[PDB]
Amino acid sequence: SHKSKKDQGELERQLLQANPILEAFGNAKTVKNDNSSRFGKFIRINFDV
Amino acid sequence: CDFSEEQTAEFKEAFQLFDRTGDGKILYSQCGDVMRALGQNPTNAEVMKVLGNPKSDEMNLKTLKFEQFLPMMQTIAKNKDQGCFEDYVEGLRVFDKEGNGTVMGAEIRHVLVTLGEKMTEEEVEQLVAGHEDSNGCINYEELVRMVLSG
Numbered sequence A: 001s002h003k004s005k006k007d008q009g010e011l012e013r014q015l016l017q018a019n020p021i022l023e024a025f026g027n028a029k030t031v032k033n034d035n036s037s038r039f040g041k042f043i044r045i046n047f048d049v
Numbered sequence B: 001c002d003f004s005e006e007q008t009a010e011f012k013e014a015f016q017l018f019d020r021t022g023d024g025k026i027l028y029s030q031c032g033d034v035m036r037a038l039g040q041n042p043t044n045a046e047v048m049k050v051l052g053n054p055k056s057d058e059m060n061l062k063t064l065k066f067e068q069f070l071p072m073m074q075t076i077a078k079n080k081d082q083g084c085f086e087d088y089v090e091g092l093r094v095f096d097k098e099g100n101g102t103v104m105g106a107e108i109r110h111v112l113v114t115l116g117e118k119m120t121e122e123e124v125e126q127l128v129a130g131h132e133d134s135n136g137c138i139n140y141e142e143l144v145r146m147v148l149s150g
């Protein structure tokens, strides 16, 4: 939103897709959770000054 | 008197210039407008507070004489409060991401629209000295000095 000349950019478009993909692979219906992770993840989002 | 009537004689002529019947009379909506145009810069609060009443929706009804607006101008002048250039400059540095007073105009626009006395986008469009290129900067200090005049 603050990229007043580069808002709605494509990287911020891809970030929202990275989770559904790794959830389609990876996640599963266990007894306790219908979208069980089955893997741990650690996302790093990198920022400029 | 708190101001020279030899120049309030000019002020009576100045009061005549804007769109009205004249006749020695201005409307309360015009009192604040004239105080902006001729007096020291009032807040809306000062217009409502000094020699008037905050319950003033439809402010074109109430009417005051030039010789009543001049008491209003004098009573404001002796009770107003004023910040120095450094106060407003620091008020900009409070937003400064760059430490150099060059943040993009969209920040100044957002602040002037969003907070306080709620300025319109077209009023800032009259104020702005920059341009909508790929850099977008507005210099703080000299543009503050250009605005803070009279």
Ligand SMILES: [Mg+2]
Residues within 6 Å of the ligand: A035, A036, A037, A038
């Ligand atoms: Mg989980």
